[PDB]
Structures are given as structure tokens and as C-alpha cells.
Design a protein around this ligand. Structure first.
Ligand code: MG
Ligand code: MG
Ligand code: MG
Ligand code: MG
Ligand code: MG
Ligand code: MG
Ligand code: MG
Ligand code: MG
Ligand code: MG
Ligand code: MG
Ligand code: MG
Ligand code: MG
Ligand code: MG
Ligand code: MG
Ligand code: MG
Ligand code: MG
Ligand code: MG
Ligand code: MG
Ligand code: MG
Ligand code: MG
Ligand code: MG
Ligand code: MG
Ligand code: MG
Ligand code: MG
Ligand code: MG
Ligand code: MG
Ligand code: MG
Ligand code: MG
Ligand code: MG
Ligand code: MG
Lengths: 258, 130, 131, 164, 141, 188
RNA sequence: UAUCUGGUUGAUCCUGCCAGUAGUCAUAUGCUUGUCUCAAAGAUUAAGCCAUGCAUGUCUAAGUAUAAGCAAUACAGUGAAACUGCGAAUGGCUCAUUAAAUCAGUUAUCGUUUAUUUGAUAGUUCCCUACAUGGUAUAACUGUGGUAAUUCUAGAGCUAAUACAUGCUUAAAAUCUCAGAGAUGUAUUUAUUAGAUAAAAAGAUGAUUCAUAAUAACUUUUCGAAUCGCAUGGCCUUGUGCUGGCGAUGGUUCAUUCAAAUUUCUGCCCUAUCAACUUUCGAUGGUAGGAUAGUGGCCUACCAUGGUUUCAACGGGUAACGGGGAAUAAGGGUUCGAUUCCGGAGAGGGAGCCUGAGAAACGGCUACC
RNA sequence: GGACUUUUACUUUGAAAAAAUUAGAGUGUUCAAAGCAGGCGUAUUGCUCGAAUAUAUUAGCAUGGAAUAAUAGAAUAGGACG
């Protein structure tokens, strides 16, 4: 009570980030930003816990102060800055870019993309209203309020962003067929098609999904991201390609490399 | 605070420091046997004033200080050493004697435990009362 | 406060304390393998019971239960990987058969005696112990 | 030692609850209205010290009166607080009249001066321009990107008007 | 409600809805209504009546969002609000058996509906509208 | 505190509850403004979130609206005549929402003349060409004309002076005026 | 990992308990104690009391430097004090209270506030300064001091701002308004209007009084940059003219994020030697207002007579904070959970309140005990 | 889209049930309790697999089933069908 929690206790931190139980007592509490605390992945995690470019926390606040680092082009010195789905990160050195993408097991994955074509970002539209003085705007999933949108784009769709300004370049409608990414649920992080909408007014819109190997599943609508035409992913995609496999299937692929 | 006591006296040889494998030797103990002896720690050492007790980290030989955390091992007096075989210290021949006695018990019977504890506590208060 | 360390008991004490049958059958296993405590025996029979516990619990699932096949292999994969399950007996529920002796055989202490090398299992133990 | 409240109108001593005015506010932060004792505005034999302010002089000087002559300790610092400390108008452009002050330690001794504020200078002028300029390039980009939108006013009213 | 509607000491009318006395469209009092959503639609008793009831799900300025529940009307004795009884069986795991339980629910009933005790009824969750009422009725079966 | 919690207050079963937790600030309420007539006076009140809110007490220069025409001329308020919550306000002439008041009404006569001109109840040319162009727009009700002969006009408040400071109302028309009329002379 | 044995008889078979047996992240305590790893720990009794010390302060290129501080041609480095800003509402501790309360899961805000982050977003202002407004003022400091005494403060003399208080600076069209001078933003508040969306003839949603726009006026007139730091490029008609770039701080609104406040369904241990309870003083509901951040008997006025209960209300008890969980487990069960996470409550007991986006705060203030 | 399948119980599946704990796959912490690590070769300017999975009872949500068990269907037809 009495105010906003500035702290995060380890084991209160999401399993996404995979931190050691024992280590220290606290987790890094994501700042306020574009995505959400639970769905974010702060800078300090990325630099030190997967890349292992940093060892201390003191290192990242010593490397971000270099302005070595940028997400969506902007520099972002805040050590505990909340970086989530679909953003990109160029780095001054290493001539090397990443986009933040889930693997099949639902955690954020390291994934590299070209110097160009990190120039663009994707985003799901969740709000379409009329602004003050009649100026229509959309809201993406990263807090971007983008004005003058192509009319009859409409909610649940996705939009390419040019990252020079908040420019909307193209848009994919949300319709039966389009390729999707799962962003929630037990099936978080899978890809493939779209085969139904149980409309369920007043309630949750469950949405039936079929993947490359023809596995049915359902996730509620706010757990799906429309990601372009089938077989033609509108974004560079990490080598796992989000398809799921049996727990017994995974064992065999290890014993292949005897 | 109620009933704890500073062990008070004088450093003659060596130094006392807060936390110490002091050997507390009562006036029964002899360096051969195990007797009125305790090997326990010296919580703190402070120098005495008139209700000031400014605390202190250690103290050399030839001075006047108090020790805390020692009292519970002391009946009335004693020598503290860190030698494996240092002897006791002379028994302070004084002049008066516990000769004028009286009888006590508690007005209320429930209080006797607080009385028997109290009589041990009073006997530490003074160097003479039996 | 930081997270709790987890810990577990490795052993389990018998129920009837003075059945000579168990008292003697235990002592035979001691001199044979050069053990000191019954804890050394108890630890192993507790392991073996913690193992049949899983084993009977998988045969109740009908063949082709993905969990049955998956940890059924995982078990035996770990049990002839040590030699306490013989290579032929890799079949499913030969596991329920093992006594403790197959484990004391695969102990380091016994091999250093059954590979020449020690002349006595009591000599083996101290040979291991002293670096 | 208790002080006198500017208007209380008592010969006695009493306790009031104090805000940021007169015998308070500090030492404690952010209000915080400690209740302290004060003494009345009217005088009586129980005082130790009375604070009097000389207003008129009369016949004979006093040695704490005439000879004792201590100075102002700081000179003006706003441009117009300097400018109209002498009567110089907007047309005098100080930095020539700001007072200096000397000090001697190691014998270059060169003076310290107070850095006028409210100073009419670039880039106070430049930033003033750069500010009003930004108002328009944004407004002009706003105005024109606004209309760039309404050319799909045509095409999407040419699939419902040019659709037969 | 009765006495036309102006039994209350305040004048009773829908807010911001205008009976303008300079255009004689002969309805002579405009009737604002809304389709409630979720399937069930406004009864003609609501469109055509002339009650006020700021709490009516159709006439009133109140909306229906949460659970929709079915109970059976057990009391019909306070003005514009009733209470229903929802019955169910609670499960006692140890005995692997059930016991009959039941809660009561005070529910606003817009004067669009005549409702008698008996009468299975369909209610939907609206904003807190009294100390005990958080549900409004939509059907009669 | 003047607390707004349900946690005093017997539950629906009739049962006195216990006091867990002291009053929290986020469930507070404040005293009413009880805003009177005249000598316009308003007090800022610092409400939650830093947001201000203006406490009318002694207001007199109250905006209004007609608004069959949409006129909204600031006009004096002279008294209150009827209140549906208790009639202890009509005799303290304290103004709240849903009170019924007498307003100056001359700024409305002197706008009726301006637009149309008759008036009740006994200079350029861009207005003459629109003067009798607007016709059939001087049909009052017997209800509303009969008042300028007395001067003061009957209106009801729609704003919340305690909250908004500015107190603004509309004017009674239709059965709204008919209903409130059958109680002003029902009291009489 | 599905086991029983001793004890009633002269003997028997029973019932049936006492005793035995095994575990306990279960406390205590006795004897004994070499190595390594791990690591609970003033919960229970007394949410009893506390000596001393510490536990919250904070500075960048970038709010204010004339330290009579260091180091050597308005200022310029470094920089105590003070102002300003921000924080102190997290953390940590404890489990006293609390039994439909808390809590868990599951809903709801078409019922609200929201610092901050992030993203979008703003040409208009006079009823005689804009090359830049006032002291509408003062700290530190100088100096005169009181008191046994506190992080007590007075009296006199200076001077800053992103402190406080102000306020002028504009095009280009149109719409009005007197062959053409001025008024036209935003927010506060009201009322009316559109928000179509079922064929032939004179935008969103399951749903809205939604978003948004329009008219007519209102206001003690809200915000609409007199702020900093780094750079100095371009212009010729070569003038403190005119221009201009990368950053910092700030602001109205909307979105967002961290939040929060309410909130729908279902679920608590023992007790009838608790069977009726609630409503004069709000009990259940109705209209109206008041109040709130906002719904609501939250409160007030008026009215009505309602609301709960044997499917256990109400009352009593708890050596009761809820929960994830712990112990024992053939299966079913039994016993626990103050305590590493989550939620909640409290800071000797009560109440109150200032500040602030956030507290009914306690290492804040006020009062009583 | 305009009128409802009388309406419930039960049961199948799915999403849901934080992390830790438990169960449990992997991994010579020298074993083990653990931990979520780690694994393959060059006198060095690298390569690479993991951080599973499950039971997470209720109540609610989505759903397939239509036995079992209730319940309404016209009898003063005021009834179905147009
Ligand atoms: Mg301060
Ligand atoms: Mg049994
Ligand atoms: Mg016998
Ligand atoms: Mg027993
Ligand atoms: Mg026992
Ligand atoms: Mg012991
Ligand atoms: Mg050693
Ligand atoms: Mg202690
Ligand atoms: Mg205690
Ligand atoms: Mg806290
Ligand atoms: Mg911003
Ligand atoms: Mg001055
Ligand atoms: Mg001054
Ligand atoms: Mg109990
Ligand atoms: Mg109300
Ligand atoms: Mg308790
Ligand atoms: Mg409990
Ligand atoms: Mg127990
Ligand atoms: Mg607990
Ligand atoms: Mg306790
Ligand atoms: Mg502890
Ligand atoms: Mg806690
Ligand atoms: Mg508190
Ligand atoms: Mg205490
Ligand atoms: Mg307090
Ligand atoms: Mg505190
Ligand atoms: Mg404290
Ligand atoms: Mg869990
Ligand atoms: Mg385990
Ligand atoms: Mg292991």
C-alpha cells in the first residue's frame, strides 16, 4: 500500500528471464516503458544474462553511459529500461543488430538481423479512436500513438514502422489465413496460419491456430500477433521458427549428434 | 537496565580488547586445577564516568575500566588472565565484616522466586554483604 | 530474503527395530562390502524404494503413454549406465527386481577390490579415502 | 530565551502551532508544523532583551550609532536590478558597471564579479528565435502532413463513388 | 412506478433528452432507449412506456458488462428492486458428495417488466447501484 | 476523516462488523459548500491527484442557458423558490443542483428584442433583412411570458457549485415548468 | 511403502483400552561431539520495555555560486553552506487485530485518480518593456543576541532562480463584424445538436448520452517556454543585422507504463449450554441532492417497509492474519502453516492531519490515554 | 440477421491455475544434499546443446458428449401450424 513498488524480489521476477534462485536476493524491476513489467526484458538482462557482454550491473550502467546502445534507434541509457517484443537494438560497436523474439519455449531469444531491415519494426494495433480535433490515431503494442492511419485498418491488425519517424508503411489485416505468433498462454511462442474466430461477445475471443505440422490449438485473442502472409514472414525470424515439438522428439535430436 | 553489572577494575599487564579469550579466575581457582574458572568472551570495554560510560575498543595496562558481559560468571571478584598458567590475585583484606544480620522473606508468597534471584543479585551489588 | 536452499533426506530407517532376520541380513552386507553404518544400507534401500515407487507407478499407465516410455527409458538409461541393471534386463520392469546388492557391487569401494587392486574390501575403502 | 511574536498582544508566554512564517519551519522538512512556545508582543519586566530599531537621532551621538558604519555586502545581479540601481535605462548595456571585488593571496589577485542574470544576450536571443522557429516548422509540417492524409479522401471515396 | 411518474418531488425525466415545445412531432416527449447488447433486446414495454427509472438497462443511463446469471424470484416486495435465489450444490471432497447451498441476490427490476415471485429470471452485472444491488434483470422465461 | 467506507455500516444480514484498518485518505469525504447568494466567493480545494476543484459559497453572477434557443446569458439570481430534497433550502436560499430559482431575466428580454422584438408585457441594416425573416419564432407559452411582467424568471440549476464553483442553470419549459408550477402554488 | 506386539484368565475366544513401535523443515532439554558442504535462528511467553550507535538522503555539461573557500576586463575551474528540484508513500520488520473480513482463484470499471517512463501533442494573449518585466522577497552570508538546556530561534543589513509574482512579440486564408480597422486558441462550467449506417418516389463496441465535431454563452482565465548547457555553420544588400545545429529542464491534453481504489462468482476452523437477527441513532429499497478521484445509504431530506436465517442467520470461542506451502502418507485421509514468495494489517493505544501524483505516513506533525 | 432450442446437473477436451516447493528429463557439484549449470579443441583474438515436462482438485471461462438424474412443454386449448 501507500504507493508504487520500486523493488522486485527474485522469484517474483518472471520465469522468462531464467535467473538463478540463489544468486542475489533481488531481481531488476523493469522501469515504466512501452510494453509491461511481466512481458518486458530489461536491458540489464540482455547485456549480461544472454550476451554476457556485461558481468556486473555496474558494467551495463558503465556501457550504456557510453551511448553504445540504442533501441528503436533511440539511445536509452536507463539500465533497468523495459525492452519487449518486436523492438530492435543496434549497437555502436560490432556493427550488429538484434530483434527481440520468442523461441518456442516462451522466453525471449537472441536473434540478429541486417544493418538495414533493422530499420523497420512491427506492431499490433489495439486502439483505433479519433483524437482531439478529429485526428484519428492508432495505438500499437509499444505505446506508439500513430496519427493519420490508413482508414479501415481497424483493431487486431499489424503495421510496419520505419523507425525514422513513427511512419506506418504497410499493414496486414487480421483475417483467416494470415501467419501469426503466439504471445501468451501455455503455447506462447508458436507460429502458423489462422483458422477461426469464436466471436464470443461479452467474453474472450478464443482463436483456433494451425501450425506447419498441422497441430490444432486455441489461444485467446490477446495472445496472438498477426505476422504477415503465410510462408512470407514480414520479419526476419530466429532459426527455431516457432513450431513446437514433443518432449520425446527433442531427446532424439540430441542423440543424433552422438 | 535492571540487574546486569559492569565488571570493574584495573588492567595490570597486557591489554583488554572487545571480544577476548579471557580466563576468569575466582578466588578458589589454582593454575593446576579447573576450578572457579571460566573461559568466556569480553563483550565490551568502557571507561567509567559519572553515568557516562563512553564505550571503547580496547585498553592497555595500568588503567581503570569496566567490562560488560562478564558479570554472570563473577560472584564478587576475580582475576582475568590469558596465560595458560597465570595465578589468581590477592583477596583484598578489608576491615569491616558481614556481622549484623537480619531475616527476610517476601510479603507475598508468589514473589519468593524474585527474592531468591534478588539475593544473588544483591550479593554482587556490594563487596561485603553475605 | 534470498531464496531457500532445498535439501532432502537420503535415507530411511526400518520399521521393526529388532528383527534378527533384518539384523543379520544387514551385517552380511556390511562385511561383504566393507560398510560401517546401517545408514549405508538404509540409504540404498531408500534409493531402491524411491525407484520402485516410480516403477510400479508407470506400469499402471497403459503401454504407449508418452510419460511411460519417456521416463521408462530415462530410468534404464541411467541404470545400465552404472551397471546396477544388466544390459539384457533393459526391458521395462526388470527394474522392480533389483536388490540392494547390485548397487553395492557398482560402488566405487567394491570395484577397487573386484578389480584386483585391493586384496580386501576393507583395504579398498581406506585406499580410496587417503587421496 | 523565548522570542516575541510580531502580533500576539499578550504580556505572558503561550504556545501556538507554527507554519512557514516566524519562529519555525526549520529544523524539520516539508511542513511539519511543530508547536512551539512564543512570547507576547507587549513588554514586561520578565524580558531579558528588547530589540529596538533606531528611527530618529536627536542631540548627542552614540558610539554604536554614528561611528559604527557597516556596509552592504552584495551588489545588484539582475540586469535591470543593476540598470535601475543608478538610472541607466535599457540603453546602457551593463557588464561595464557591474561591481568588482579584489582579493590577494599569491599576487595575481585578479577580481571576482557576480555574473549578471536576466542578461540580454545570445543565445537568450538565439534560443528565443530557435524556440519560435520550432513552433512553425512543426506547425507547417503538421498543417501539410495533415492535408497529405486527405488524398485517400479521394481513392477511398472512389471505391464508394467510382464503383459502378 | 406509478402516478404517471411525477410522484417524486423532483420532476422526473430522462437527462439531456428534449421534449421541445416548438416542434410538434406528436410523440410530444422523446423516448431515449438503447439495445442492451448480448442478444436480448429492448422490450416494447420499454420503448413505449413512460416511466423514468434512471436504473433501467434500456431507459436508464446504466450498462451491463459482467456475469449474466439465472435465479428464481423469491421476493417481490421493494420498489423497483427484487431478490432472487440461486441454488447450487457444493462439493465436499472427503465424502465425494454434495450439499445443497444457496445465495440470495438483490436485483433491480426496471418497470419494463412485470415480475411475480416464482418466475425464473435472467440478470446481468451492472455498476453498483445501491448498497446491495449489482444486478439488473433482462428476461422472464 | 469524514469517511466514505462501507466498512462501518451493518452488512446486509444485519450484523455489526469489526474495525480492521484505520480510515485511509483515499476514502475521505468533505463538508458541503452550502453556497449562498451574493458576494461571489469561491475556494480552491486540493483534491486527489493534485487536481483542483472550486468551492462556491456566496455566488451571485451565475451563467445560465435558455435553451430552446441556446442563449446562455450571465444573469443575477435573486432567490430560491422550491427544492425537492428539503424545503429548508428554499428558506435559507442556498443553491445546489436541482434547486429552482428566480433569475434577473432582463438580459433575455434584451436579447429577445435583439433577435426578434415584441416583447413583454406592456443600428445597421444586416439585422432588418434578418428581422422578419425569422418568423413564427415569438410563440412563448402563457407560462413563460407572464413572468417578465413580474421581471424575475423561473429556472432550475444543473451545475454543482460545491465542485465547479461556477454555478450555471437552465430555464423551466414544458411540463417541467408545469410540474414545478403545480407545487409552487400548491404550497401557496 | 497395504506388517503389528505386551497387559483382564487356572486356561480359552472376544470386546476394549493402556503400553509398546516408526516419522516429524518440531520446540525444548540431557549426555557426547573430529573433517567437509548446506544454514533455521527472541514467532509461541510480553504488538512488553528499551541505555548507546547506526538504519535516507540526493549533483549533472546542462536550476541558483561574489564562500572575504581553494587553484589563477559580467561570469566561466574546483566548490562547503543555503535556496530550488527530487526522494523520503519503496525497503525492512512484525502478525496484534481480523471469520464472508482478509485471502485464493475468477470477473468488472459503459464507475474512477494516476508522479514517473514511453509515444503523440499547442502560431492567436494589449480593455505604452520583448535586445527580455517586478521586489509584489528572502536563505546561505555579514553583524547584534537571548536560553541550564533541543536539528530553538529572534533583531538589524545585503543578493540569486527552472523559488514566488508577472506579462507584451507576429504570418498566411476564411468566418463574422464597421469603398475595409478589430475580434477568432486551450482549459473550467452549462444547455442544445449531429454521431446516419432497413430498398424503390416531391468511425468503434455485444451495447452507451462513447470517442469526435457543431451552436449559444460562462470563468477570480488552466496550460499556451522572459529557462539552462554544448556548439558556432550559413547570408550579403558585411550590421551585438539576419540566420542556424546536437542536447538538457519544464507544460495543457490524450495515449502508454508502474500503480492504485472499488468490484462479479464460488470457497473458511469449534460452538445451539447461541434461534431468531437487523430498523428510534441507515436497517433493505425508492426520488432528489450533498460529498468523493468516481459507483454506492457513502452521508442528508423525503418516502416506502423492507433485508438475513435450520441449505444454520445472529451470537459466543479461537492458544486464527489468508494463501503458495510443511509433517505423516497403500488408497482414502489426519495434523499443521508467526516464519525466505504473494496479498493484507500495524508501527505503545486511539483519533486527527500537513505535505505530496501517492500516506489517513509514524525513523512526519497535532491532541488525548 | 428477426423469433429460441424449457433449463440444470454430470463427464470428455482446451485455455486457466505466478515463482519457489513437490514429482520429474537432462548435466561425474570428484559422489551426495544440491545447484542450473555445462559440453568439443587450439600455445590462443572461437564453436555449441540446456535452463524440459507434469499433477497444478474446487468456482468461473471455452468445449465435445446427450447415457444417468432432474425440469417445461397444449386438457376451461387461450394451444402448434398460415
Ligand atoms: Mg526541501
Ligand atoms: Mg490403514
Ligand atoms: Mg494370571
Ligand atoms: Mg501411543
Ligand atoms: Mg514420536
Ligand atoms: Mg543437547
Ligand atoms: Mg582439512
Ligand atoms: Mg533482541
Ligand atoms: Mg514476541
Ligand atoms: Mg513496505
Ligand atoms: Mg512525454
Ligand atoms: Mg530590493
Ligand atoms: Mg527584498
Ligand atoms: Mg485451530
Ligand atoms: Mg446520487
Ligand atoms: Mg491472533
Ligand atoms: Mg491457519
Ligand atoms: Mg504438526
Ligand atoms: Mg502464513
Ligand atoms: Mg502468535
Ligand atoms: Mg528473520
Ligand atoms: Mg509479507
Ligand atoms: Mg500503515
Ligand atoms: Mg514496543
Ligand atoms: Mg500514524
Ligand atoms: Mg515507515
Ligand atoms: Mg523507528
Ligand atoms: Mg507454483
Ligand atoms: Mg527435486
Ligand atoms: Mg545430482
Amino acid at each position: 500500500a501507500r504507493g508504487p513498488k520500486k523493488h522486485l524480489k527474485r522469484l517474483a521476477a518472471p520465469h522468462h528471464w531464467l535467473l538463478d534462485k540463489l544468486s542475489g536476493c533481488y531481481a531488476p524491476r523493469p522501469s515504466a516503458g512501452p510494453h509491461k513489467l511481466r512481458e518486458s526484458l530489461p536491458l540489464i538482462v540482455f547485456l549480461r544474462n544472454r550476451l554476457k557482454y556485461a558481468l556486473n550491473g555496474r558494467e551495463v550502467k558503465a556501457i550504456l553511459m557510453q551511448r553504445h546502445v540504442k533501441v528503436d534507434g533511440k539511445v536509452r541509457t536507463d539500465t533497468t529500461y523495459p525492452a519487449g517484443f518486436m523492438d530492435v537494438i543496434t549497437l555502436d560497436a560490432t556493427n550488429e543488430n538484434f530483434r527481440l523474439v520468442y523461441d518456442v519455449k516462451g522466453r525471449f531469444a537472441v536473434h540478429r538481423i541486417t544493418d538495414e531491415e533493422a530499420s523497420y519494426k512491427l506492431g499490433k494495433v489495439k486502439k483505433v479512436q479519433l483524437g482531439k480535433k478529429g485526428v484519428p490515431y492508432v495505438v500499437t503494442h509499444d505505446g506508439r500513438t500513430i496519427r493519420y492511419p490508413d482508414p479501415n485498418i481497424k483493431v487486431n491488425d499489424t503495421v510496419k514502422i520505419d523507425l525514422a519517424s513513427g511512419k506506418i508503411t504497410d499493414f496486414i489485416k487480421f483475417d483467416a489465413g494470415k501467419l501469426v505468433y503466439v504471445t501468451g498462454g501455455r503455447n506462447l511462442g508458436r507460429i502458423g496460419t489462422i483458422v477461426h474466430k469464436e466471436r464470443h461477445d461479452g467474453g474472450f475471443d478464443l482463436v483456433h491456430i494451425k501450425d506447419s505440422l498441422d497441430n490444432t490449438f486455441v489461444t485467446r485473442l490477446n495472445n496472438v500477433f498477426v505476422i504477415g502472409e503465410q510462408g512470407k514472414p514480414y520479419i526476419s525470424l530466429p532459426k527455431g521458427k516457432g513450431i513446437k515439438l514433443s518432449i520425446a522428439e527433442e531427446r532424439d535430436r540430441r542423440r543424433a549428434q552422438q | 537496565d535492571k540487574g546486569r553489572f559492569y565488571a570493574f577494575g584495573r588492567v595490570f599487564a597486557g591489554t583488554v580488547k572487545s571480544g577476548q579469550k579471557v580466563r576468569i579466575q575466582g578466588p578458589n581457582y589454582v593454575p593446576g586445577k579447573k576450578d572457579d574458572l571460566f573461559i568466556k568472551a569480553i563483550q565490551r570495554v568502557v571507561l567509567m564516568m559519572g553515568r557516562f560510560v563512553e564505550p571503547i575498543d580496547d585498553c592497555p595496562a595500568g588503567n581503570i575500566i569496566g567490562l560488560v558481559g562478564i558479570d554472570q560468571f563473577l560472584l564478587k571478584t576475580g582475576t582475568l588472565t590469558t596465560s595458560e598458567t597465570a595465578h589468581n590475585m590477592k583477596v583484598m583484606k578489608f576491615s569491616v565484616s558481614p556481622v549484623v544480620q537480619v531475616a527476610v522473606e517476601v510479603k507475598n508468597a508468589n514473589d519468593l522466586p524474585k527474592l531468591v534471584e534478588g539475593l544473588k543479585r544483591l550479593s554482587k551489588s556490594d563487596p561485603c554483604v553475605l | 530474503p534470498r531464496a531457500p536452499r532445498t535439501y532432502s533426506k537420503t535415507y530411511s530407517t526400518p520399521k521393526r527395530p529388532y528383527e534378527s532376520s533384518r539384523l543379520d541380513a544387514e551385517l552380511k552386507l556390511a562385511g561383504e562390502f566393507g560398510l560401517k553404518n546401517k545408514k549405508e544400507i538404509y540409504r540404498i534401500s531408500f534409493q531402491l524404494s524411491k525407484i520402485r515407487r516410480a516403477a510400479r507407478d508407470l506400469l499402471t499407465r497403459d503401454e504407449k503413454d508418452p510419460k511411460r516410455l519417456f521416463e521408462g527409458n530415462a530410468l534404464i538409461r541411467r541404470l545400465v549406465r552404472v551397471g546396477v541393471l544388466s544390459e539384457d534386463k533393459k526391458k521395462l520392469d526388470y527394474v522392480l527386481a533389483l536388490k540392494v546388492e547390485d548397487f553395492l557391487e557398482r560402488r566405487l569401494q567394491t570395484q577397487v577390490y573386484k578389480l584386483g587392486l585391493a586384496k580386501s574390501v576393507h583395504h579398498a575403502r581406506v585406499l580410496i579415502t587417503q587421496r | 530565551g523565548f522570542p516575541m511574536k510580531q502580533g500576539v498582544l499578550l504580556p505572558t508566554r503561550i504556545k501556538l502551532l507554527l507554519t512557514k512564517n516566524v519562529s519555525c519551519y526549520r529544523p524539520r522538512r516539508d511542513g511539519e508544523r511543530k508547536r512551539k512556545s512564543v512570547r507576547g508582543a507587549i513588554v514586561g519586566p520578565d524580558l531579558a532583551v528588547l530589540a529596538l530599531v533606531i528611527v530618529k537621532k536627536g542631540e548627542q551621538e552614540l558610539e554604536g550609532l554614528t561611528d559604527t558604519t557597516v556596509p552592504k555586502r552584495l551588489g545588484p545581479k539582475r540586469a535591470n536590478n543593476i540598470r535601475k540601481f543608478f538610472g541607466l535605462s535599457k540603453e546602457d548595456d551593463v557588464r561595464d558597471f557591474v561591481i568588482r571585488r579584489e582579493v590577494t593571496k599569491g599576487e595575481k589577485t585578479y577580481t571576482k564579479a557576480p555574473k549578471i542574470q536576466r542578461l540580454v544576450t545570445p543565445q537568450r536571443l538565439q534560443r528565443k528565435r530557435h524556440q519560435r522557429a520550432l513552433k512553425v516548422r512543426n506547425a507547417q509540417a503538421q498543417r501539410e502532413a495533415a492535408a497529405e492524409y486527405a488524398q485517400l479522401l479521394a481513392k477511398r471515396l472512389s471505391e464508394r463513388k467510382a464503383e459502378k | 412506478t406509478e402516478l404517471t411518474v411525477q410522484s417524486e418531488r423532483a420532476f422526473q425525466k430522462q437527462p439531456h433528452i428534449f421534449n421541445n415545445p416548438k416542434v410538434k412531432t406528436s410523440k410530444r416527449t422523446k423516448r431515449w432507449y438503447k439495445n442492451a447488447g448480448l442478444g436480448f433486446k429492448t422490450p416494447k414495454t420499454a420503448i413505449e412506456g413512460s416511466y423514468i427509472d434512471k436504473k433501467c438497462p434500456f431507459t436508464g443511463l446504466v450498462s451491463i458488462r459482467g456475469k449474466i446469471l439465472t435465479g428464481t424470484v423469491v421476493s417481490t416486495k421493494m420498489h423497483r428492486t427484487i431478490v432472487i435465489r440461486r441454488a447450487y450444490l457444493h462439493y465436499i471432497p472427503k465424502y465425494n458428495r454434495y450439499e445443497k447451498r444457496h445465495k440470495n441476490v438483490p436485483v433491480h427490476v426496471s418497470p419494463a417488466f412485470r415480475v411475480q415471485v416464482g418466475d425464473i429470471v435472467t440478470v446481468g452485472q451492472c455498476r453498483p447501484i445501491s448498497k446491495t444491488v449489482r444486478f439488473n434483470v433482462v428476461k422472464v422465461s | 476523516g469524514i469517511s466514505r467506507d462501507s466498512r462501518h455500516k451493518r452488512s446486509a444480514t444485519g450484523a455489526k462488523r469489526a474495525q480492521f484498518r484505520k480510515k485511509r485518505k483515499f476514502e475521505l469525504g468533505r463538508q458541503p459548500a452550502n453556497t449562498k447568494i451574493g458576494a461571489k466567493r469561491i475556494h480552491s480545494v486540493r483534491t486527489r491527484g493534485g487536481n483542483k476543484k472550486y468551492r462556491a459559497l456566496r455566488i451571485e453572477t451565475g451563467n445560465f442557458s435558455w435553451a430552446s434557443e441556446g442563449i446562455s446569458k450571465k444573469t443575477r439570481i435573486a432567490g430560491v423558490v422550491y427544492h425537492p430534497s428539503n424545503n429548508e433550502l428554499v428558506r435559507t436560499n442556498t443553491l445546489t443542483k436541482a434547486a429552482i430559482v428566480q433569475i434577473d431575466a432582463t438580459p433575455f428580454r434584451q436579447w429577445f428584442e435583439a433577435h426578434y422584438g415584441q416583447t413583454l408585457g406592456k443600428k445597421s441594416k444586416n439585422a432588418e433583412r434578418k428581422w422578419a425573416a425569422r418568423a413564427a419564432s415569438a410563440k412563448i407559452e402563457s407560462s413563460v411570458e407572464s413572468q417578465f411582467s413580474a421581471g424575475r424568471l423561473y429556472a432550475c440549476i444543473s451545475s454543482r457549485p460545491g465542485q465547479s464553483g461556477r454555478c450555471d442553470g437552465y430555464i423551466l419549459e414544458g411540463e417541467e415548468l408545469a410540474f414545478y408550477l403545480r407545487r409552487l402554488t400548491a404550497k401557496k
